[PDB]
Amino acid sequence: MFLFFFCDLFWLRLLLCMYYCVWSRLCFIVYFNCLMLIFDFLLFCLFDLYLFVGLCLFLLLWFMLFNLYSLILYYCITYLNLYLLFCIVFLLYIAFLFLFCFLCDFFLFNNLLVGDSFMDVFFIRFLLCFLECFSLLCRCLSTFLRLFCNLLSSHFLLLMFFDFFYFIFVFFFYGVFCYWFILFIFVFCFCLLFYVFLYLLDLFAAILQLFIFCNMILQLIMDFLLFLLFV
Amino acid sequence: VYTRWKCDRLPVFQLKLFTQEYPMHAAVGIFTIIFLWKHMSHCSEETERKYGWWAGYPYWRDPIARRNETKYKQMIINNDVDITHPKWTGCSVEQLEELSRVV
Amino acid sequence: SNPADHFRPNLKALTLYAERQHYVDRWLHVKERWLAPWYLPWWSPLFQLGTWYSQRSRNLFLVENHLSYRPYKFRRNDEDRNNPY
Amino acid sequence: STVAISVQGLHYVGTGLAAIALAGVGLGIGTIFGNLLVACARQPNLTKMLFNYAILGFALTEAIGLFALMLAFLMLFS
């Protein structure tokens, strides 16, 4: 089976071509922490710690073109599938993990054995090591699941509320002319307030979830970085 | 001065980017694509009927049946298949003629 | 249900079907055509890359002796849990 | 006599029970951020380290809640 379909970004691609044929400065970045990993001067890293910048920027752009514009009615999030997000997160997370593992430095994993020598190795330290090695994969899974489900839930709620608003607005507006107009006016004002609140909440959460999607990957990278001091 | 992004053409820059900038990511992507097309590239007829149609499966015309009919007719005509062979029917040609005369 | 139906791609254009046997055979023919010429010795890394892994996978499949039953991959109906056939 | 029964609707009740685990997740997240504000109020210059550890704690707590969601969706579609 081979299905032929198209993404819902064609108009946005056209706009990008129209508006970015000429250069323009970028100063506001959703995830700025990917550009400033080191805060104490004289610390430098021999590992390619700035390799994630390009992928971070492209992912932010793509996910913003999809999620933020999905608030507009009938706009489709073409990539909204659990296993597709799993594939994306797998690619990124496992690529960085294999970059660290291909380094063939086993000492890099010494920190996995949590704790100190004073704790039982077999019954305490080793169990915690197993749990943490499990927690890495759990972090990958959690990133992808959170990204999927936030969107799905928010859009379900928006659709339900819009259906209710359409129903009451269409089939109960005549009450404006009746003696119970005050009840309808109160309900309509409540619905408008809720509409505005939902839109603001979704706009903020769409950007926050991308902050956190990129932050998880950057945290994975940082968990294995070692900084040397200049002398 | 020379820079990959400004001087090289798009295919060359793409190859350089995915070979000397993000090679592990490209490798993992190819691995995942192969897995997807090896284990998630099939859909049974029942699955298509349940979920494969936007508004539902139009049983009143059964497009799947017509599709399979066209497929099998094309295969038979092109490959010169004798569908009356005993293996297809499980009985000899004379027995088939006897059955036709009976029914 | 109706709310759930709103999360589908909205620009589906065409669907093509192909049996695994047919396109696998076509790919094998292409690989044989490109790996046949004399100027590609069997001991070259390219030829081994092309052939060895496929041979190993097929051999693993042939040697398989499973006590359980694996239903046909391309049945007409696989949505029934109580009917592997 | 031996009787085997298969009810369709019991896959809904189990799903709702798993969602209750989210109650112990949402509260746990609120606890972390509640302590974050106090910690910032006490050592405001150290906001960055506190903020990062809060995100780490939030990440771990969310991971647990998702495992509940994994079961919730597995049963809902089963």
Partner: peptide, 29 residues
């Protein structure tokens, strides 16, 4: 729910793979 479906997952993921392998370089340059 299609978002939870897998009967055409490969074709669905081809969109992301095309974006990553073919559109990211253009956006990059």
């Amino acid at each position: 729910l299609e978002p939870m479906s897998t009967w055409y997952l490969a074709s669905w993921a081809m969109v992301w793979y095309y974006a990553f392998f073919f559109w990211m370089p253009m956006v990059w340059t």
